[PDB]
């Protein structure tokens, strides 16, 4: 209560030096209960100053002056100046007004979105402040909706300046941390809106195995249940809780077959038409909810109702879980209306996520975003994106920006959901992004033409998709370790560049560029290739330091902004000198944790990586060319070491140290080989190819090689050749 | 009209002529004050060049060497000497690349691709340097012409081009620092040798005269109106022209008909970025492709 | 007035601020004690150093506890305060709503440097007479952003010289100075000629100023004030009367390079009209496209 101040009809709680709760109450009673958004207001004491007069109060922290002149909250009575100079005159917050600078957050869904859509604000601002209004209902101690807050205005003023990571950590302290995901969530998911049989689904899973594509999750979309078989008097077949017996004559046996293949199983649930009289569970639900069965009274969807929720979980979901369903895909698109005023999507995510923990430890849902704090109910499901280059070009930005409201587990339909147009290169670029996204779930529309199976495409596209799908499983150790860091430390897997580089203007000018964990920087290509180059491109900002392409070892001297070119089969992913990345050596092998880790080391600096696991922690240190691996607990795990180009240690057990000062630091990547390959694939004149190869071979001085390419009439070819010269400088 | 006069001044003969039109007079004061002043400056330069031209004329007559040579006379085995049709040697000390295309209005500058042979080259007017061998697009305002001299070049100029006198009473010896050089000034009744050897400049003549010699070494007049044969040591004197990247960058950005935000960003970034390779990488991102080439010319000269 | 300012110790004493907590004297023009400390202890010492009048440059919104726009409070009170030390003194500030003509001069602010901005500005200026706000001062040549074009700068100065106020101003760019010698010799000489013409016109302007003050007649009138029943008086947005003896049709479009001349469609009312500079005659009534070199402006005077 030292950090609590009352003045007129207002209450101010100084939670941190940079976070102030602001309340109004007509009744002089203020709200202590949790809300849909806020789970915890216990924060360590902080120092601040007050100037309290007859008519006014000023609260002063290290970063903000908050002023209240009494009366009802207006833009004139309640306002704040930040103690920063990030702008010339955008340093003042006025109650109920917008200011410039917000770096945005996320939105409910990408349903029906072709390219960009507007986002809600987040808690991050280039000008150093943000206000997060709490407009939600209060909860009970066990987490049911209690009704309206007695704080009829309840706001959180964030004044973290450009300390974005601390703003997000303290947001997680206020709204609750993200829970740990289970390891299975981080592998490849298969999904398709397609009327598979038990037989054709298992045949497809076995084809994945034959094709060397690993999967963690088998999604079964809505054709699992009755659709066309629903009498039209009941409405549509969109909602269903009854297996189609022609396609799934023995559901538990089919789910047992997926479980024997080490797949987790989820079903699509369209909840909005509730439980109607044709459904297999209807007789039990009708008994529980005292429905008029002779008038075929439906159990209408009503998540405000405790008895409805219990019948839904116990008598509708329950029998399907007993057949082996592992977790629920909540696919809600029917609006925000309820008698309580609570969004039905929030009620579903909150209650289903809680219910999911009963049968499985660290279980998930798959559902759309339900507003600030809904990160407590992973995973995010963005929905029915339009299949286009424009949609892909929006999606990396969308994903990293979501970290600004703490929603760090978006699962996008990889390759896009529906409508749009066919382009196998779009499908391949989208999968590249997906593999370097929070979740890699392949999914598609009801079209006969939109399957994301790699072997849908030509041999080049197929092989590249298989390679990227294998890479996702190689990355599960790195992903699972980052997941435990999200849960315990409040750090997002995917960060916008400005989290690490808040004072670099270029960190705000590369919307689709992001940090992926702590060791990798990703610049997805999201534009159709230039046919004259047979390469796509993206402008990359390289921070200070020496950077390596993660795949090729091509080097780049930061700090620089440089257009980079890749063939459709290659993705721009970069690691600094000293980076250490663990990889599963056996990504196809079905085993709860890897029996073998590859330690991939980028030479040129010291580094360190901590591999967090279910039942271990393993530290890899690279210090003055000595690489050491230690673990809390011992195991039979075999460690492989790759130092730049070369495997140094194969399948060594236990803790150890090896000196790498003696070993070759340099990657094989060389200017001449890369130049020949770019000229060779280009759809340009052979005379141009001959002249460029000859002149760049003959001209010795780097500055004169650049002058030569500066004369080229092909402006994009100049930029491609300039990237090679910059790396070879 | 102005570009054509620039070429004419660096051609065998500079004869202004026109049609029967009331509208085609080549009088400088036909044009606006900027065009007029530039035409007057080039017309004065033609008379400053008469000593150099007359000496080359006597070399045509006695030695069979053309005043104007295609690049391939001096550089027969260089492919680039066959790829710059409008580029030529003008006497033995100067290389000319006339601009013969209408200016790019976004830059307020015309341009020409110049082949620089091996060696260090200087713009004859500005001292802007270029390291050969390179092919480089060069940009000039409509009032300026690409004319180049190698390190060690010695060019005589009439100090008094308006003065009516059968032979100049005063010669300016314009010396380009950085190498040895030599020039023989053939005249009606004399030969005068200017030698630049290990930083010692010597002037000797067959016959004596009252002619007064002026010496300009790079930027600076060293000797004013000295009579007779003499020698002066220039090892002690400033070799460098004033030409500098920063001044030239500001002028190009200032005249350009582009966005002020672009001007501000380019000036700021090229001032802040220290490493030459990263300055080039910055200009490589510019959406204006010709502006890239203009900024690249300045970075190449400032490397 | 924040705690680092030279006048802060005096303002802190007057307004009983907590100096050890560095309490700022926040802007509050609703507050009599704040206004008096602002005029007497903040402006006052700067006026004593010789400041003649105040450029009030307010861009931070319309919010106050009173509901009165802070810009109105500034213009109303500063204009009144300015009369203490100088007779008929001015301010320079943005428009604060109907009646704010009582506090000249108008300051239009941070226009984008473009042909489009110039093409709007004569219309903007004459139309303002319709709410009695007749002393707009525009940044001549445009304020910020936009693009370089020495002809735009010259056309903008031509308009400025025939506008209520001729104030050259620019952005923080190293590249946007309005100095005539920034430009080439042709542009420089023309800008110098127009700048000299502004001072030649001060007698005419000062006489019109006294007519605004005493008779309620704007210096700049839309054509329809003099010709209310002529449809063509509503079809020449940038054309205006300038005092009672001159009619101005600024050129606000980039020249046609084939002609080396810009142009504007001029409506000539009934009567015999002369170009003010050349004496070129025109028989009204007619609508006629007129062409001028970039150094010449269409300004006309009737016979007599
Ligand atoms: O469960 C089937 C799919 O339903 C939702 O998407 C629908 C889409 O595939 C198509 O049929 O259009 C409608 C109307 O826009 C969508 O509601 C889910 O978004 C999707 O993931 C399912 O596969
Ligand atoms: O006092 C400096 C200038 O401030 C205002 O204009 C600013 C402008 O020059 C630039 O910095 O952008 C900001 C944001 O749009 C403007 O506030 C005045 O309008 C101007 O007259 C001053 O010169």
Domains of chain C: 1-220 (3.20.20.80)
From the list C292, C261, C288, the residue with the least C-alpha distance to C276 is C292
Whole-angstrom distance, CA of residue A7 vs CA of residue A30: 12
Q: What is the largest CA-CA distance in chain A?
A: 92
Whether C145 contacts chain B with CB within 8 A: yes
Distance of CA C136 from the midpoint of ligand 2 (Å): 17
Burial (CB count <10 Å: 0-12, 13-18, 19+), residue C4: exposed
Q: Which residues contact A98 (CB under 8 A, 6 or more apart)?
A: none
Which of A135, A178, A187, A159 is closest to A23 using CA atoms? A135
- The answer to whether residues A68 and A90 touch, using CB atoms and an 8 Å cutoff, is no
Output the CA C105–ligand 1 centroid distance in Å: 62
Search chain B and give the residue with CA nearest C295: B32
Round the CA-based radius of gyration of chain A to a whole number and report it: 28
CA distance C20 to A339: 54
A707/B135 CB distance under 8 A: yes
- In ligand 1, the atom with minimum distance to the C-alpha of A333 is 17
- Nearest atom within ligand 2 for CA of residue C172: 9
Mutate to test the interface with C, among B1, B256, B260, B270 (most CBs of C within 10 A): B260
**A99 contact C CB<8A:** no
Please identify, by atom number, the ligand 2 atom nearest to the C-alpha of residue C170: 23
Residues A417, A110, A136, A11, CA torsion sign: positive
**Sign of the C-alpha dihedral computed for residues A507, A513, A514 and A519 taken in this order:** negative
In terms of CA atoms, which chain A residue is nearest residue C69? A76
Q: Do residues C246 and C225 lie in contact, with contact meaning Cβ atoms separated by under 8 Å?
A: no
- Partner-chain residue, chosen from A561, A710, A715, that has the shortest CB–CB distance to B285: A561
Q: How far apart are CA A422 and CA A330, in angstroms?
A: 28
Distance from CA of A704 to the nearest CA of B (A): 6
Mutation target vs B (from A707, A719, A721; most B CBs, 10 A cutoff): A707
Q: How many residues does chain C have?
A: 304
C69 Cβ contact partners less than 8 Å away, ≥ 6 residues apart? C62, C96, C97
3-state secondary structure A512-536: CCEEECCCEEECCCCCCCECCCCEE
CB A438 within 8 A of CB A414: no
Residue B183 DSSP SS3:
strand
SS3 A224: helix
Structure tokens at A182: 């289970």
- Using a CB–CB cutoff of 8 Å, tell me whether A703 touches chain B: yes
Q: Where are the beta strands (DSSP E) in chain C?
A: 54-55, 91-92, 106-107, 136-137, 139-140, 167-168, 220-222, 240-242, 246-248, 262-268, 272-275, 281-283, 286-292, 299-302
Choose the closest CB to B293 out of A706, A710, A719: A710
**Ligand 1 centroid distance, CA of B267 (Å):** 52
Say yes or no: A90 contacts chain C, CB-CB below 8 A. no
Residue partners of A261: CB distance under 8 A and separation at least 6: A205, A206, A209
The Cα–Cα gap between C145 and C157 comes to: 18
CB-based contact, C145 to chain A, within 8 Å: no
Distance C55 CA to ligand 2 centre (A): 12
Beta-carbon separation of B260 and C173 below 8 A: yes
Q: Among candidates B98, B116, B194, which has minimal Cα distance to B155?
A: B194
Structure tokens at A693: 């190869």
Structure tokens, A320: 């399907």
* C-alpha distance across the termini of chain A, in Å: 62
Omega before residue C285 within 30° of 0, cis: yes
Ligand 2 contact via C57 beta carbon (within 6 Å): yes
- Å from A543 to nearest chain B CA? 13
φ and ψ of B131, to 5 deg: -85, 110
As a whole number of Å, the end-to-end CA separation of chain C is 57
* Exposed/middle/buried for residue A282 (C-beta within 10 Å: 0-12, 13-18, 19+): buried
Burial (Cβ within 10 Å: 0-12, 13-18, ≥19) of residue A638: middle
Residues at CB less than 6 angstroms from ligand 1? A 112, 193, 221-222, 268, 331, 333, 383-384, 418, 445-446
Give ∠ CA C188-C194-C198 in degrees, rounded to 5: 140
The two structure tokens encoding residue B152: 């060690």
- What strand order describes the sheet that includes A217-220? A365-366, A327-330, A264-269, A217-220, A188-190, A440-442, A413-414
Burial string for A512-541 (b: 16+ CB within 10 Å, else e) reads bbbbbbbbbbbbbbbeebbeebbbbbbbbb
Q: What is the dihedral of CA A418, A422, A423, A427, to 10 degrees?
A: 30
Q: Is C144 near ligand 2, meaning CB less than 6 Å away?
A: yes
Burial grade of A663 (CB within 10 A; 0-12, 13-18, 19 or more): middle
User: Is B220 part of the contact surface with chain A (CB cutoff 8 Å)?
Assistant: no
Q: Could you report how far apart the first and last alpha carbons of chain B are, in Å? A: 35
A563 with B134: Cβ contact below 8 A: no
A236 C-alpha vs ligand 1 centroid, how far in Å? 14
DSSP class of residue A378 equals P
CA angle A96, A99, A105 (to 5 degrees): 95
Q: Which two tokens stand for residue A714?
A: 């092909």
- A231 and A202 Cβ atoms separated by less than 8 Å: no
Summary count for chain B: helices (H), strands (E): 8, 16
Pairing of strands B230-233, C272-275: unpaired
Nearby residues of A143 by Cβ (< 8 Å), 6 or more positions away: A34, A350, A354
Residue nearest to atom 21 of ligand 1 (CA): A383
Residue A438, number of CB atoms within 10 A of its CB: 29
DSSP state, residue A273: G
| Contact A358/B at CB under 8 A | no
Task: Give me Rg for the CA atoms of chain C.
Answer: 22
Q: Does C176 touch chain B (CB under 8 A)?
A: yes
Strand order in the sheet with A130-133: A4-7, A10-16, A19-24, A153-158, A130-133
- Technique of determination: X-ray
CA dist A565 and A530 (Å) reads 10
3-state secondary structure of B119: coil
Q: In the beta sheet, which residues pair with residue B215?
A: B173, B223
* Token pair belonging to A457: 């495409």
B22 interface with A at CB cutoff 8 Å: no
Contact C185 B254 (CB under 8 A): no
C-alpha distances in angstroms, A412 versus A416, A430, A434, A470, B184? 8, 10, 8, 19, 80
- How far, in Å, CA of A287 to CA of A726, rounded? 74
Q: Pull the structure tokens for residue A73.
A: 């909250």
Which residues are CB-neighbours of B22 under 8 A, at least 6 positions away?
Answer: none
H or E segment to which residue B185 belongs:
strand B181-187
Q: How far is the CA of A17 from the CAs of A165, A720, B44, B268, in angstroms?
A: 15, 49, 75, 36
Residues in chain B: 303
Q: Which long-range contacts (CB under 8 A, 24 or more apart) does C119-122 make?
A: C119/C238, C119/C252, C119/C253, C121/C156, C121/C159, C121/C163, C121/C252, C122/C159, C122/C163, C122/C237, C122/C238, C122/C239, C122/C240, C122/C248, C122/C250, C122/C252
Tokens linked to A720: 């491609």
Q: Could you tell me the sign of the dihedral formed by the alpha carbons of C261, C262, C264, C266, in that order?
A: negative
Pocket of ligand 2 contains residue C112 by CB under 6 Å = no
């Amino acid at each position: 209560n030292n950090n609590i101040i009352k003045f007129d009809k207002a209450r101010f709680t100084v939670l941190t030096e940079h976070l102030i709760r602001i309340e109004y109450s007509e009744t002089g009673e203020f709200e202590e209960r949790m809300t849909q958004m806020v789970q915890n207001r216990e924060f360590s004491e902080v120092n601040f100053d007050i100037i309290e007069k007859e008519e006014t109060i000023e609260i002063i922290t290290s970063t903000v002056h908050l002023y209240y002149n009494g009366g009802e909250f207006t833009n004139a009575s309640l306002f704040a100046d930040v103690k920063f100079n990030f702008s010339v005159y955008s340093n003042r917050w006025y109650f109920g007004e917008k200011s410039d600078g917000n770096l945005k957050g996320t939105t409910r869904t990408l349903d029906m979105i072709d390219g960009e859509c507007p986002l809600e604000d987040g808690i991050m601002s280039k000008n150093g402040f943000a206000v997060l209004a709490d407009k939600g209902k209060v909860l009970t101690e066990v987490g049911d909706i209690a009704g309206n807050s007695v704080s009829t205005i309840d706001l959180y003023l964030f004044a973290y300046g450009r300390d974005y990571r601390q703003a997000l950590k303290d947001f997680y302290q206020l709204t609750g941390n993200t829970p740990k995901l289970p390891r299975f969530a981080l592998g490849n998911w298969w999904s398709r809106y397609y009327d598979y049989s038990d037989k054709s689904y298992l045949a497809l899973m076995d084809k994945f195995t034959d094709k060397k594509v690993p999967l963690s999750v088998s999604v079964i979309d809505m054709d699992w249940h009755k659709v066309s078989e629903v009498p039209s008097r009941f409405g549509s077949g969109w909602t269903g809780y009854s297996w189609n017996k022609k396609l799934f004559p023995n559901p538990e046996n089919f789910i047992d077959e997926l479980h024997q293949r080490k797949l987790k199983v989820t079903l699509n649930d369209h909840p909005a038409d509730g439980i109607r009289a044709f459904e297999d569970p209807y007789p039990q639900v009708a008994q529980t909810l005292d429905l008029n069965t002779e008038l075929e009274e439906a159990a209408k969807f009503d998540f405000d109702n405790l008895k409805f929720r219990k019948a839904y979980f116990e008598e509708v979901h329950g029998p399907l879980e007993k057949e082996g369903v592992d977790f629920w895909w909540i696919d809600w698109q029917q609006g925000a209306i309820s008698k309580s005023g609570v969004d039905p999507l929030w009620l579903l995510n909150h209650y289903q996520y809680q219910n999911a923990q009963k049968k499985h430890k660290n279980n998930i849902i798959l559902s759309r975003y339900a507003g600030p704090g809904s990160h407590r109910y992973p995973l995010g499901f963005s929905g029915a994106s339009v299949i286009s280059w424009a949609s892909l070009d929006f999606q990396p930005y969308f994903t990293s920006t979501a970290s600004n409201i703490g929603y760090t587990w978006w699962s996008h339909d990889i390759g896009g959901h529906m409508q749009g147009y066919k382009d196998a290169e779009l499908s391949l670029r989208w999968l590249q992004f997906g593999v370097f996204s929070p979740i890699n779930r392949l999914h598609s529309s009801k079209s006969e033409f939109t399957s994301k199976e790699p072997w849908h495409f030509d041999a080049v596209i197929e092989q590249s998709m298989i390679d990227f799908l294998q890479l996702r499983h190689q990355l599960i150790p790195y992903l699972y370790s980052a997941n435990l860091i999200t849960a315990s430390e409040g750090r997002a897997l995917v960060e916008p560049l400005y989290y690490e580089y808040p004072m670099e203007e270029e960190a705000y000018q590369h919307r689709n560029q992001y940090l992926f964990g702590e060791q990798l920087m990703v610049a997805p290509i999201t534009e159709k290739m230039n046919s004259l180059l047979q390469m796509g491109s993206v402008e990359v900002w390289f921070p200070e330091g020496t950077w390596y392409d993660f795949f090729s070892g091509q080097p780049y001297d930061g700090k620089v902004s440089l257009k980079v070119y890749r063939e459709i089969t290659e993705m721009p992913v970069f690691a600094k000198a000293g980076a250490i990345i663990p990889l599963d050596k056996n990504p196809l092998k079905k085993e709860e944790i890897p029996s073998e880790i590859i330690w991939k080391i980028f030479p040129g600096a010291d580094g360190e990586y901590l591999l967090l696991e279910e039942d271990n922690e393993t530290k890899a240190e690279f210090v003055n060319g000595i690489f050491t691996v230690t673990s809390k607990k011992e195991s039979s795990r075999k460690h492989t070491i790759i130092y730049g180009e070369h495997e140094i240690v194969s399948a060594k057990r236990g803790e150890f140290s090896i000196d790498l000062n003696g070993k070759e630091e340099n990657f094989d990547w060389n200017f001449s080989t890369a130049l020949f390959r770019r000229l060779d694939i280009a759809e340009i004149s052979y005379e141009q190819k001959d002249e460029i190869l000859q002149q760049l071979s003959l001209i010795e001085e780097h500055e004169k090689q650049v002058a030569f390419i500066k004369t080229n009439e092909n402006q994009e070819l100049q930029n491609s050749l300039f990237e090679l010269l910059y790396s070879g400088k």
